[PDB]
Symmetry: D2
């Protein structure tokens, strides 16, 4: 509907503006939409995204470690599989179809904007609890969902149709909704039904906001091969 990824995400998104818009309506995203993004920039982004996925997968495994209920653990385990026995292996196939070797991929030098983001999310998770970690992971998961859904409606080229159909597709949208349910359930379990009244709420929104800014930096990196 209006707010397809749960209550907590909708509230965090609203507190993260205007960075959220700068992220989801970034020039890189507009290039994907119109098929005007240069190939070189897309391929650079793919290679860096391969490294990003390694560390993002580790962060989702950390969410399992930080889970308190079997339910939390299963949702996180589900996402680790959605990434490590699916999205990563497909992604390598996409790089490979676009010309990038497997040895060259493995030697990918991680850009600062990439490292900044994944180390931010991992450290948030190690130092805080599951809610800190989910706050840090949400902008990636839900932002790609929102961008994919929009571009499914608005793309004027199929050049980047595979990317768009990945994030706009039912499987990915369902995974976003599942993460939204996890976030809502984790918040309510720990902080109560009125979770926005906890002092923690401001911290969590700040973590989400920081991760949103780091996403903007990742797209800017993508434009600067």
């Amino acid at each position: 509907m209006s707010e397809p990824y749960g209550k907590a995400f909708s509230l965090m998104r609203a507190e993260a503006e205007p960075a959220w818009r700068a992220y989801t309506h970034h020039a890189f995203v507009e290039g994907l939409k119109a098929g005007t993004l240069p190939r070189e920039a897309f391929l650079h982004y793919l290679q860096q995204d391969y490294v990003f996925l390694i560390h993002f997968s580790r962060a989702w495994a950390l969410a399992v470690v930080k889970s308190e209920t079997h339910s939390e653990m299963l949702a996180a385990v589900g996402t680790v599989n959605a990434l490590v026995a699916e999205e990563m292996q497909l992604h390598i196939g996409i790089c490979e179809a676009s010309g990038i070797s497997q040895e060259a991929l493995f030697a990918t030098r991680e850009r600062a904007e990439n490292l900044a983001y994944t180390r931010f999310v991992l450290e948030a998770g190690y130092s805080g609890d599951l809610l800190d970690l989910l706050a840090a992971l949400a902008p990636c998961v839900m932002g790609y969902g929102e961008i994919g859904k929009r571009l499914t409606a608005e793309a004027t080229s199929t050049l980047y149709g595979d990317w768009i159909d990945t994030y706009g597709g039912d499987d990915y949208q369902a995974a976003c909704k599942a993460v939204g349910t996890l976030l809502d359930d984790a918040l309510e379990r720990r902080l109560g039904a009125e979770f926005t009244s906890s002092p923690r709420w401001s911290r969590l929104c700040q973590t989400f906001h920081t991760a949103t800014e780091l996403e903007v930096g990742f797209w800017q990196m993508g434009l600067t091969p």
Copy 2:
């Protein structure tokens, strides 16, 4: 064959005697073999093992976080699924078929011997690297493999046939072998082909030995509902 779970395990096992024998030939295990273990002791063990599996699953998720190669991560992810989208949900079914409610299971008070062991393994993993963690996890994985394989050959009752056929069965044996390959590959990657010449080797054997002793304590707990 002789040494079915890889080189590192065979070497650690040999350094962990006589605790290793005290673990794999424990009175609790002999009760399973002969079908003489009392029902009350088995059911108590099942309930505690349900809690143990929660934390052991988290420890295997930690192994993903501590992985350096896609290969390490996939092996660990594989094991988390073997535990969290399989062994845990089956285990609840076994408790449930034996009479234990789902609410009562969720309120299971963790025994000290249980907590000692899982917190030992988790802390080893958080504080050390992947090798520390695998050293701590190996006695559980491979010990159950060795016990199941033996009891498949030696059981004189089918009373505990489901337990025996779980750990003696091809799926579990294959999973043990996979963990053995991971341990060997992780050791060689980090410490080199002559990994027993690293000063780390003695530390890792000590961690494995401690975890073996904690297994002996877990079986002793099982006998003392």
Copy 3:
């Protein structure tokens, strides 16, 4: 006064009965009070407490890592020094005055009851946030404070006067009060003034209760050299 270590501790203590009494009025403690505890049991306890202090010091260093404010960090840093550039080095001197070598001390085999407790506290800290960690550490800090203060008033022998005067003395009592202030301030910062109304509160009391039970196990270990 009545409740000398802050509001949160007083509330957690009350939720941890009757384990709290079993801890602070344990037979080992009564032996210290009356000077009837056997020397062999005291020396065994000292050696195990040397290992305990290593890991407890690491847990207080973890509290620094998990701190959010300069104030939290300074309080934790203060306690790490109170332990690592003071209590540990004095403790070695006490073992040494009682006959135990420095090499034999370093080879101290950690008892299960000891390991259980320190790994419990460390894992709570790594997996949760600062509040989980402080909940787990509080029974050690404040329990020794309460026992030392009582035994200062009630001891009928000076045999264990050094131990009693350590924990009953102004320096240690001041350190207990400082930890109580940290716990109260950390709770209020994260959960608000009405922190007992957070769903987290029950979890934290449970962690504190578990650690109190593990203390009872540590004294029982002490009686069983």
Copy 4:
């Protein structure tokens, strides 16, 4: 002498060129040397360095947690004090003497280059062992030592004399040497006397190299208020 901070640092430094030179002979550093760095850039750097020190202090507390010997722990505890009961409180005094409020300091928005670096070091420490963490911390500690020592000999202005005399002074140089001894001792304990023959050695040099590049980014941030 030639190589004043121990064997391991000298070897890592040599593997990190030319980034090491780009770090220690950065334009920002040349501005400090000649007193030509603009005040605005220096003050921006001070404020960001206040946040950096918070997280760097946490990373040194993590080194305590990851220590295996009392000696390792004491060296790390020593450094946490050198930072948290000394350098941080002095640093606030320096900001304050240069005009920056205490409330405005506390609201310091962390730059991406700052966050990238501290989250990199913390995550390295959480995910790896003490050696990973020290490899990540060494460029900060020893680089400031090398820069301070050089600028003590080569500065043509006293404008930034306080900064130069901090890092060039005997106390800081002694602290650098102490960290060098810790790094050498930790390496030899874990990997043996021939530690450069371990496969780990290449990983550790890479971590150190990455952190050196992140230092270059921090100085570049400093030039871009």
